[PDB]
């Protein structure tokens, strides 16, 4: 449909770990970042690739990973040890097929959350749950980057988060079918699991630390957007004659927070300020059927008006609720980001905003949406 599954939500599900064997050479590249790029050999084995077509690439998930496996090498390959030693030129060999690919999923060619998260993980036992111990990520930067916690714990919020967005469909039928007590047990539920998503997303203490998220991690899921460091962003060679800008990897590129923003009608896309712009931009780094589904969400009768009409107060609890949820993961996620980022940095996000500033807008501007104070 919106390429939405039941079980894991916006997740890429059951991703392919492998390549066709035409595509040996960037497997290896990718599969083999940590020691590449500690000897410094990385960039050296980038530039020796021949020029591979995409067109071995027969369906989604191997796109998918395809495009993951190039991100990866195009983070490493711009970055480096991240000590300052930049690449301002993607070498043609992995620029063009990687634009090439980009271009086909509809995705700007650097990595994203849907690469990173959505699709770099892996079932340990194909036959046991969706726990952080039977999963894997299929891709890391560098030894000590914590990615598989970052990654694995990210897609656990969003699988979290999976369960209250089969629900939306329910949501929308009782409005338009005037089902008053569906309708209320539909946003009890999508507010249960939204709570039961903050619980998981404390599982970011037990597997990240600050100090290799913050020095090591991070500057692989930086991009080149208002980057000083890039100011003018990153030359495709062979595809593109001039350098491109694009913003880092961030789950303000997840769709799970737009969703229930626009599905309960929280404007957090309205006006021109850097926050509705951030988060309007952010939805041309989500994969193009996520990107529809909340547009189609958007186009949709507002839950919040019916409520709000209805002089229901069972109704605007159940609502309330969801708000609620939704501001209680926020003020969760700036203890986050002040353990991860603020700190660590006295001893911007990878996205590319002033981060407190915006993150309390969000916020501030999803309390604003509740009912009754
Ligand atoms: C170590 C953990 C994390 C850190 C340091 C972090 C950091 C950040 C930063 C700096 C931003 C601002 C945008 C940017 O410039 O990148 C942001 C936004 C955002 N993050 Fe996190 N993040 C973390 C984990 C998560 C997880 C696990 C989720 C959910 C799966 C999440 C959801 C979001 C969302 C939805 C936004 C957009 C702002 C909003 O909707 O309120 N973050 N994050
Ligand atoms: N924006 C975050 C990084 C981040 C948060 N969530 C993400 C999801 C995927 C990739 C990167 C991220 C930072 O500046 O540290």
């Keep these: 449909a919106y390429h939405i599954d039941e079980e894991v939500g916006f997740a890429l599900p059951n991703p392919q770990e492998n390549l066709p064997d035409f595509y040996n050479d960037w497997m290896f590249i990718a ?3 940590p020691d590449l790029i500690e000897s410094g050999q990385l960039r050296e084995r980038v530039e020796k690739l021949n020029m591979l077509s995409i067109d071995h690439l027969t369906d989604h998930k191997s796109q998918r990973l395809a495009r993951l496996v190039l991100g990866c090498i195009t983070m490493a390959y711009v970055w480096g040890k991240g000590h300052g030693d930049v690449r301002k030129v993607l070498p043609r060999n992995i620029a063009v097929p990687y634009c090439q690919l980009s271009a086909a999923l509809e995705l700007p060619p650097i990595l994203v959350y849907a690469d990173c998260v959505l699709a770099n993980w892996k079932k340990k036992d194909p036959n046991k749950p969706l726990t952080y111990e039977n999963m894997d990520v299929l891709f890391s930067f560098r030894d000590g980057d914590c990615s598989k916690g970052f990654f694995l714990v990210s897609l656990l919020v969003e ?3 999976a369960s209250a967005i089969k629900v939306i469909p329910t949501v929308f039928k009782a409005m ?9 047990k539909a946003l009890l539920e999508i507010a249960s699991c939204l709570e039961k998503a903050l619980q998981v997303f404390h599982q970011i203490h037990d597997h990240v630390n600050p100090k290799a998220f913050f020095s090591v991690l991070r500057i692989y899921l930086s991009g080149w957007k208002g980057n000083p460091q890039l100011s003018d962003g990153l030359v495709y060679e062979g595809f593109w004659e001039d350098p491109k800008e694009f913003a880092g990897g961030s789950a303000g590129q997840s769709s799970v927070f737009q969703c229930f923003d626009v599905l309960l009608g929280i404007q957090q896309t309205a006006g021109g300020g850097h926050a509705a712009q951030f988060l309007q931009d952010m939805r041309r780094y989500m994969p193009p059927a996520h990107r529809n589904f909340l547009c189609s969400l958007e186009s949709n009768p507002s839950v919040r008006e019916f409520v709000l009409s209805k002089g229901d107060a069972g109704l605007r609890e159940a609502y309330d609720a969801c708000v609620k949820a939704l501001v209680s993961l926020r003020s969760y996620h700036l203890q986050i980001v002040t353990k991860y980022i603020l700190i660590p940095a006295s001893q911007k996000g990878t996205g590319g905003t002033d981060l ?5 807008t969000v916020r501030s501007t999803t309390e604003k949406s509740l009912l009754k104070e």
């Design 159 to 161: 699988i979290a988060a």
């Design 31 to 33: 599969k083999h970042l």
């Design 176 to 184: 338009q079918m005037q089902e008053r007590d569906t309708l209320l």
């Design 356 to 360: 407190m500033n915006f993150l309390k």
